[PDB]
Amino acid sequence: MLAVGIVGLPNVGKSTLFNALTRANALAATIDKNVGVVPLEDERLYALQRTFAKGERVPPVVPTHVEFVDIAGLVKGAHKGEGLGNQFLAHIREVAAIAHVLRCFPDPDPLEDAEVVETELLLADLATLERRLERLRKEARADRERLPLLEAAEGLYVHLQEGKPARTFPPSEAVARFLKETPLLTAKPVIYVANVAEEDLPDGRGNPQVEAVRRKALEEGAEVVVVSARLEAELAELSGEEARELLAAYGLQESGLQRLARAGYRALDLLTFFTAGEKEVRAWTVRRGTKAPRAAGEIHSDMERGFIRAEVIPWDKLVEAGGWARAKERGWVRLEGKDYEVQDGDVIYVLFNA
């Protein structure tokens, strides 16, 4: 489960935020109070829908989503008291990226929370290397091919000592294998979510705090996404066309959550590929780099182990052509093998065995 962990200290709105996210899921077709999914909007999905509308009846479209998790909620829930700090770190370790909610409008310091949560991860990570190096600094004098990771491990270790996060360490073949071998919380991507007075939407310009943030975020390698748990509390209920308006109202073309959900998507370096027919259109998600059969994996598993090949064509072409058959006459549906690297937008039909 690639998922974004929302985390935030009290009275910042983290509660309204996650709450709508659920509320939306909620106003929709077992209450996992701390787990929610923001459906992603994908225009391509409808273009594909027309292309297979046989008449005026059309087929259903299923979008893909981004999973969001409430770190604390999850930590509370189960039952400890001892080492709440560690249970936190245990989950924060289980998610691909961290979405920290920062408040940027007084109510009845966001840069400071930004520092608390970071410094914690920074400390935890330090133990993680101090301890890895003990072992790895020694493995290194027996086996030489473990020597490139020492460098990496060393460099990384000084870096954190300087307050600096893993995520901002210069990439190298070396490093990368090291991080996979020893996952560092500060290596995960960070999305500083700025909660603002909705009179500040779309990006709360000329609002020093939300501007303060933008400047930390740049020093920390985090992206920034602005929103109003509040507006996000309203939109929660309005109907698409009615949310359409309210969004129109403050003139935003995307819900604050959506904003965050794609920022999520980027952070997890994710990408899309759909299956499209007369009976259904659908967006599937995979991490860039995934190969044609692991992709078939998602839809179903018999598809990956029985994978013979995949017919593939970009959603635009398939659309420009009117359907499968014609796309083939235009000679545009490629036949791809076991190691074809699925591409964003790609449309796939898999020829598998059993």
Short mmCIF file of C-alpha atoms in Angstrom, two decimals:
data_model
loop_
_atom_site.label_atom_id
_atom_site.label_comp_id
_atom_site.label_asym_id
_atom_site.label_seq_id
_atom_site.Cartn_x
_atom_site.Cartn_y
_atom_site.Cartn_z
CA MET A 1 0.00 0.00 0.00
CA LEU A 2 1.60 3.22 -1.18
CA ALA A 3 -0.16 5.74 1.02
CA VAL A 4 0.25 9.22 2.28
CA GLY A 5 0.37 9.66 6.02
CA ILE A 6 -1.23 12.77 7.25
CA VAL A 7 0.33 14.08 10.39
CA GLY A 8 -0.14 17.26 12.26
CA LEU A 9 -0.12 18.68 15.83
CA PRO A 10 -3.31 19.89 17.50
CA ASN A 11 -5.63 22.76 16.41
CA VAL A 12 -4.32 23.16 12.90
CA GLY A 13 -7.27 21.64 11.25
CA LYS A 14 -5.71 18.32 10.63
CA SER A 15 -8.98 17.06 12.08
CA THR A 16 -11.34 18.93 9.68
CA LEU A 17 -9.10 17.92 6.76
CA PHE A 18 -9.00 14.21 7.23
CA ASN A 19 -12.58 14.45 8.32
CA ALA A 20 -13.90 15.74 5.05
CA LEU A 21 -11.76 13.24 3.13
CA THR A 22 -13.63 10.59 4.98
CA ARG A 23 -16.93 12.53 4.84
CA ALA A 24 -16.70 12.56 1.05
CA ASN A 25 -15.82 8.85 0.76
CA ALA A 26 -18.58 8.69 3.33
CA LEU A 27 -21.24 10.46 1.22
CA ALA A 28 -20.61 7.76 -1.35
CA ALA A 29 -21.89 4.47 -3.05
CA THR A 30 -17.12 -0.62 7.73
CA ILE A 31 -16.02 2.80 8.97
CA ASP A 32 -12.23 2.88 8.83
CA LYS A 33 -12.24 6.26 10.51
CA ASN A 34 -8.52 6.76 9.85
CA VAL A 35 -8.26 5.49 6.34
CA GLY A 36 -9.55 7.36 3.34
CA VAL A 37 -9.10 7.55 -0.42
CA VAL A 38 -9.34 10.75 -2.57
CA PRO A 39 -10.58 9.67 -6.13
CA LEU A 40 -8.38 11.27 -8.74
CA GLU A 41 -9.97 13.28 -11.56
CA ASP A 42 -8.81 12.13 -14.99
CA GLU A 43 -10.29 13.80 -17.96
CA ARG A 44 -8.93 11.06 -20.19
CA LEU A 45 -11.26 8.81 -18.43
CA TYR A 46 -14.28 10.50 -20.10
CA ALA A 47 -12.81 10.97 -23.50
CA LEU A 48 -12.28 7.18 -23.35
CA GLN A 49 -15.90 6.79 -22.22
CA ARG A 50 -17.30 8.49 -25.30
CA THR A 51 -15.04 6.43 -27.58
CA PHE A 52 -16.87 3.31 -26.31
CA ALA A 53 -20.29 4.72 -25.89
CA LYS A 54 -22.27 2.39 -28.16
CA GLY A 55 -25.19 4.78 -28.80
CA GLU A 56 -26.14 7.29 -26.07
CA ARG A 57 -25.83 4.69 -23.30
CA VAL A 58 -22.27 4.86 -22.09
CA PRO A 59 -20.17 2.58 -19.96
CA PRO A 60 -19.02 3.25 -16.36
CA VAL A 61 -15.66 4.81 -15.63
CA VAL A 62 -13.74 3.88 -12.38
CA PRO A 63 -11.04 6.29 -11.42
CA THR A 64 -7.88 5.47 -9.53
CA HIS A 65 -7.15 7.15 -6.14
CA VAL A 66 -4.54 8.14 -3.58
CA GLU A 67 -4.70 6.48 -0.12
CA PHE A 68 -4.38 8.80 2.84
CA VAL A 69 -3.79 7.62 6.37
CA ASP A 70 -4.23 9.32 9.69
CA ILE A 71 -0.97 8.59 11.46
CA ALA A 72 -2.12 9.60 14.90
CA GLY A 73 -5.62 8.19 14.64
CA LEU A 74 -4.01 4.83 13.80
CA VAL A 75 -1.54 5.24 16.75
CA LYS A 76 -4.40 6.17 19.17
CA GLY A 77 -6.95 3.52 18.21
CA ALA A 78 -4.89 0.37 19.14
CA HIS A 79 -3.93 0.35 22.75
CA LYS A 80 -0.66 1.44 24.26
CA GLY A 81 0.42 4.59 26.14
CA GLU A 82 4.00 3.45 26.46
CA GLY A 83 6.08 4.64 23.56
CA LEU A 84 3.47 6.60 21.67
CA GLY A 85 6.47 8.23 20.17
CA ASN A 86 7.64 4.90 18.81
CA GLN A 87 4.28 3.69 17.57
CA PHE A 88 4.25 6.91 15.63
CA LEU A 89 7.53 6.27 13.99
CA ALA A 90 6.39 2.66 13.31
CA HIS A 91 3.53 3.77 11.14
CA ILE A 92 5.19 6.81 9.61
CA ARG A 93 7.63 4.14 8.38
CA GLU A 94 4.79 2.16 6.72
CA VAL A 95 3.67 5.01 4.30
CA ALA A 96 5.32 6.34 1.10
CA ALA A 97 5.05 10.02 1.87
CA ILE A 98 4.27 12.43 4.63
CA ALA A 99 1.63 15.11 4.42
CA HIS A 100 2.05 17.45 7.46
CA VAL A 101 -0.83 19.91 7.97
CA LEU A 102 0.39 23.42 8.86
CA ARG A 103 -2.03 26.07 10.07
CA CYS A 104 -1.51 29.50 8.55
CA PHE A 105 -4.34 31.69 9.98
CA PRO A 106 -4.82 32.57 13.68
CA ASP A 107 -8.06 31.34 15.30
CA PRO A 108 -10.31 31.69 18.44
CA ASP A 109 3.23 28.90 14.55
CA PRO A 110 3.13 26.66 11.42
CA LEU A 111 6.83 26.96 10.73
CA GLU A 112 7.40 25.65 14.28
CA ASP A 113 5.36 22.49 13.94
CA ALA A 114 7.22 22.02 10.69
CA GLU A 115 10.36 21.93 12.83
CA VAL A 116 9.03 19.61 15.59
CA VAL A 117 7.90 16.77 13.34
CA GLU A 118 11.00 17.11 11.19
CA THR A 119 13.55 17.09 14.03
CA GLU A 120 11.85 13.94 15.41
CA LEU A 121 12.29 12.01 12.18
CA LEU A 122 15.78 13.47 11.99
CA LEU A 123 16.63 12.00 15.40
CA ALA A 124 15.12 8.62 14.67
CA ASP A 125 16.96 8.40 11.45
CA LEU A 126 20.27 9.23 13.20
CA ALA A 127 19.91 6.27 15.51
CA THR A 128 19.09 4.18 12.39
CA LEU A 129 22.51 5.16 10.79
CA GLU A 130 24.64 5.37 13.97
CA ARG A 131 23.52 1.78 14.34
CA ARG A 132 23.83 0.78 10.62
CA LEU A 133 27.28 2.21 10.40
CA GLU A 134 28.41 0.19 13.49
CA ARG A 135 27.64 -2.94 11.54
CA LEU A 136 28.25 -1.62 7.97
CA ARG A 137 31.44 0.21 8.78
CA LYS A 138 32.82 -3.18 9.78
CA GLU A 139 31.26 -5.42 7.10
CA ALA A 140 33.13 -3.05 4.86
CA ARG A 141 36.65 -4.23 5.76
CA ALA A 142 35.98 -7.89 4.84
CA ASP A 143 33.94 -7.42 1.67
CA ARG A 144 34.97 -4.64 -0.66
CA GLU A 145 31.76 -4.48 -2.68
CA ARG A 146 30.08 -3.14 0.43
CA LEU A 147 32.50 -0.24 0.22
CA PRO A 148 30.43 2.07 -2.01
CA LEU A 149 27.55 2.02 0.50
CA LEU A 150 29.86 3.06 3.29
CA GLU A 151 30.62 6.34 1.49
CA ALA A 152 26.95 6.87 0.92
CA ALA A 153 26.08 5.85 4.48
CA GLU A 154 28.86 8.22 5.73
CA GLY A 155 27.92 11.17 3.57
CA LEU A 156 24.26 10.66 4.47
CA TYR A 157 25.13 10.50 8.19
CA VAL A 158 26.99 13.90 8.15
CA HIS A 159 24.17 15.35 6.17
CA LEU A 160 21.66 14.52 8.88
CA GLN A 161 24.03 15.71 11.47
CA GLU A 162 23.78 19.05 9.87
CA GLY A 163 19.98 19.15 10.32
CA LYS A 164 19.68 18.22 6.69
CA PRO A 165 17.10 15.57 5.51
CA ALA A 166 17.81 12.44 3.51
CA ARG A 167 15.38 13.53 0.85
CA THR A 168 17.85 16.35 0.02
CA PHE A 169 20.94 14.14 -0.28
CA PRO A 170 22.53 14.25 -3.81
CA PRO A 171 21.55 11.16 -5.70
CA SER A 172 24.12 8.54 -6.70
CA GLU A 173 23.78 4.89 -7.69
CA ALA A 174 25.40 4.24 -4.39
CA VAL A 175 23.11 6.23 -2.18
CA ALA A 176 19.91 4.84 -3.77
CA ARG A 177 20.76 1.21 -3.04
CA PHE A 178 21.68 2.26 0.49
CA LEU A 179 18.27 3.90 1.11
CA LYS A 180 16.47 0.85 -0.21
CA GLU A 181 18.52 -1.30 2.07
CA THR A 182 17.96 0.96 5.10
CA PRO A 183 14.74 3.06 4.67
CA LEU A 184 15.13 6.50 6.21
CA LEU A 185 12.00 8.38 7.26
CA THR A 186 13.50 11.71 6.15
CA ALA A 187 14.17 10.09 2.69
CA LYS A 188 10.38 9.84 2.15
CA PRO A 189 8.82 12.83 0.30
CA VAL A 190 7.14 15.61 2.20
CA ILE A 191 4.12 17.62 1.26
CA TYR A 192 3.69 20.63 3.67
CA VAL A 193 -0.12 21.12 3.51
CA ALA A 194 -0.91 24.81 4.35
CA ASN A 195 -4.29 25.37 6.02
CA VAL A 196 -5.52 28.89 5.30
CA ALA A 197 -8.44 31.24 5.73
CA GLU A 198 -10.43 30.56 2.58
CA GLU A 199 -10.25 34.28 1.80
CA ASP A 200 -6.70 33.36 1.16
CA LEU A 201 -7.35 30.63 -1.36
CA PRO A 202 -6.09 29.79 -4.06
CA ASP A 203 -2.51 29.91 -2.73
CA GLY A 204 -2.81 32.52 -0.06
CA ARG A 205 -0.47 34.97 -1.80
CA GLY A 206 1.00 37.81 0.27
CA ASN A 207 0.25 35.80 3.47
CA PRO A 208 3.74 35.76 5.15
CA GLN A 209 3.17 32.45 6.92
CA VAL A 210 2.12 30.52 3.80
CA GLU A 211 5.04 32.31 2.31
CA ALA A 212 7.27 31.36 5.20
CA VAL A 213 6.39 27.78 4.51
CA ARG A 214 7.14 28.02 0.84
CA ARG A 215 10.60 29.05 1.86
CA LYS A 216 11.24 26.19 4.32
CA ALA A 217 9.82 23.67 1.89
CA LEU A 218 12.43 24.71 -0.61
CA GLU A 219 15.20 24.09 1.97
CA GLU A 220 13.66 20.82 2.92
CA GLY A 221 12.80 19.47 -0.55
CA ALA A 222 9.05 19.35 0.29
CA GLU A 223 6.31 20.43 -2.09
CA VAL A 224 3.59 22.74 -0.84
CA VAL A 225 -0.21 22.40 -1.29
CA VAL A 226 -2.60 25.10 0.16
CA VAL A 227 -6.17 24.47 1.27
CA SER A 228 -8.89 25.23 3.81
CA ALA A 229 -10.03 22.33 5.93
CA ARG A 230 -13.14 24.56 6.29
CA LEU A 231 -13.96 25.03 2.59
CA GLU A 232 -12.92 21.43 2.33
CA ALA A 233 -15.54 20.85 4.99
CA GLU A 234 -18.20 22.49 2.85
CA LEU A 235 -17.32 21.07 -0.59
CA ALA A 236 -17.48 17.80 1.21
CA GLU A 237 -21.29 17.90 0.82
CA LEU A 238 -22.09 20.08 -2.23
CA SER A 239 -22.80 18.17 -5.45
CA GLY A 240 -20.18 18.12 -8.20
CA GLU A 241 -21.98 20.89 -10.14
CA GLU A 242 -22.68 22.68 -6.84
CA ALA A 243 -19.13 22.21 -5.59
CA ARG A 244 -18.36 23.19 -9.16
CA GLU A 245 -19.91 26.55 -8.37
CA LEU A 246 -18.48 27.11 -4.89
CA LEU A 247 -15.12 26.31 -6.33
CA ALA A 248 -16.10 28.68 -9.10
CA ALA A 249 -17.20 30.97 -6.27
CA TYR A 250 -13.59 31.39 -5.02
CA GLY A 251 -12.63 30.56 -8.60
CA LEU A 252 -10.57 27.41 -8.03
CA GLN A 253 -10.74 24.64 -10.62
CA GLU A 254 -9.72 21.89 -8.16
CA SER A 255 -10.81 20.91 -4.62
CA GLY A 256 -8.14 21.53 -2.03
CA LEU A 257 -7.98 17.82 -1.44
CA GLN A 258 -7.50 17.14 -5.16
CA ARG A 259 -4.68 19.64 -5.02
CA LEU A 260 -3.08 17.35 -2.26
CA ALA A 261 -4.05 14.08 -3.92
CA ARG A 262 -1.96 14.90 -7.04
CA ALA A 263 0.81 16.29 -5.02
CA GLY A 264 0.55 12.92 -3.42
CA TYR A 265 0.75 11.19 -6.78
CA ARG A 266 3.88 13.08 -7.78
CA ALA A 267 5.60 12.32 -4.47
CA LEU A 268 5.06 8.60 -4.95
CA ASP A 269 6.44 8.98 -8.55
CA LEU A 270 3.24 7.17 -9.64
CA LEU A 271 1.70 6.84 -13.12
CA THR A 272 -1.43 5.67 -14.93
CA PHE A 273 -2.57 3.18 -17.50
CA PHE A 274 -6.20 2.27 -18.19
CA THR A 275 -8.08 -0.60 -19.57
CA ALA A 276 -10.91 0.57 -21.89
CA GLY A 277 -13.74 -1.35 -23.55
CA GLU A 278 -17.45 -1.19 -24.28
CA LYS A 279 -18.23 -2.57 -20.94
CA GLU A 280 -15.94 -0.29 -18.93
CA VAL A 281 -13.19 2.27 -18.80
CA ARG A 282 -10.78 2.30 -15.78
CA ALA A 283 -7.62 3.93 -14.42
CA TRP A 284 -4.99 1.72 -12.81
CA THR A 285 -2.01 2.96 -10.91
CA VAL A 286 1.66 1.83 -10.86
CA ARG A 287 4.98 3.22 -9.90
CA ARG A 288 6.85 4.59 -12.80
CA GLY A 289 9.29 1.90 -13.82
CA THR A 290 6.81 -0.92 -13.56
CA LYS A 291 6.90 -3.37 -16.50
CA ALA A 292 4.09 -4.62 -18.63
CA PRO A 293 3.31 -7.72 -16.68
CA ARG A 294 3.56 -6.33 -13.11
CA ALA A 295 1.10 -3.75 -14.51
CA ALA A 296 -1.21 -6.52 -15.66
CA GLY A 297 -0.62 -7.56 -12.05
CA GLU A 298 -3.06 -5.00 -10.67
CA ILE A 299 -6.12 -5.84 -12.71
CA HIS A 300 -5.45 -9.47 -11.86
CA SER A 301 -2.55 -11.82 -10.98
CA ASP A 302 -3.24 -14.68 -13.43
CA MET A 303 -2.48 -11.91 -15.85
CA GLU A 304 1.01 -11.44 -14.64
CA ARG A 305 2.01 -15.08 -14.33
CA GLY A 306 0.18 -16.07 -17.52
CA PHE A 307 1.41 -12.96 -19.31
CA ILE A 308 1.99 -13.67 -23.04
CA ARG A 309 1.75 -10.00 -24.21
CA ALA A 310 -0.02 -6.70 -24.00
CA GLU A 311 -1.58 -4.67 -26.80
CA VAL A 312 -0.91 -1.03 -25.99
CA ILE A 313 -1.73 2.44 -27.37
CA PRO A 314 -1.82 5.94 -25.84
CA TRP A 315 -5.30 7.03 -24.63
CA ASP A 316 -5.14 10.00 -27.08
CA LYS A 317 -4.50 7.78 -30.26
CA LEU A 318 -7.10 5.23 -29.22
CA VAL A 319 -9.43 8.21 -28.82
CA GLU A 320 -8.46 9.97 -32.06
CA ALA A 321 -9.22 6.65 -33.76
CA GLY A 322 -12.67 5.89 -32.46
CA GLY A 323 -12.03 2.48 -30.93
CA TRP A 324 -9.79 -0.59 -30.96
CA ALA A 325 -10.36 -1.94 -34.44
CA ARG A 326 -9.81 1.43 -36.16
CA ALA A 327 -6.77 2.15 -34.07
CA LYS A 328 -5.44 -1.17 -35.47
CA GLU A 329 -6.31 -0.15 -39.06
CA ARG A 330 -4.43 3.07 -38.42
CA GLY A 331 -1.77 0.55 -37.36
CA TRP A 332 -1.39 2.20 -33.91
CA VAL A 333 -1.91 -0.57 -31.31
CA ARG A 334 1.55 -1.89 -30.42
CA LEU A 335 2.33 -5.52 -29.23
CA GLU A 336 4.57 -5.34 -26.10
CA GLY A 337 6.61 -7.93 -24.18
CA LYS A 338 7.52 -9.02 -20.70
CA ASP A 339 9.76 -6.07 -20.29
CA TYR A 340 7.80 -3.18 -21.75
CA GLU A 341 7.82 -0.22 -19.44
CA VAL A 342 4.13 0.90 -19.07
CA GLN A 343 3.74 4.61 -19.84
CA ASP A 344 1.52 7.38 -18.43
CA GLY A 345 -1.64 7.48 -20.40
CA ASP A 346 -0.99 4.00 -21.90
CA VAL A 347 -4.03 1.88 -22.71
CA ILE A 348 -3.70 -1.83 -22.26
CA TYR A 349 -5.29 -5.05 -23.30
CA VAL A 350 -3.49 -8.09 -21.96
CA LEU A 351 -3.16 -11.45 -23.71
CA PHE A 352 -2.40 -13.93 -20.90
CA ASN A 353 -2.89 -17.65 -20.39
CA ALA A 354 -4.69 -19.14 -17.38
#
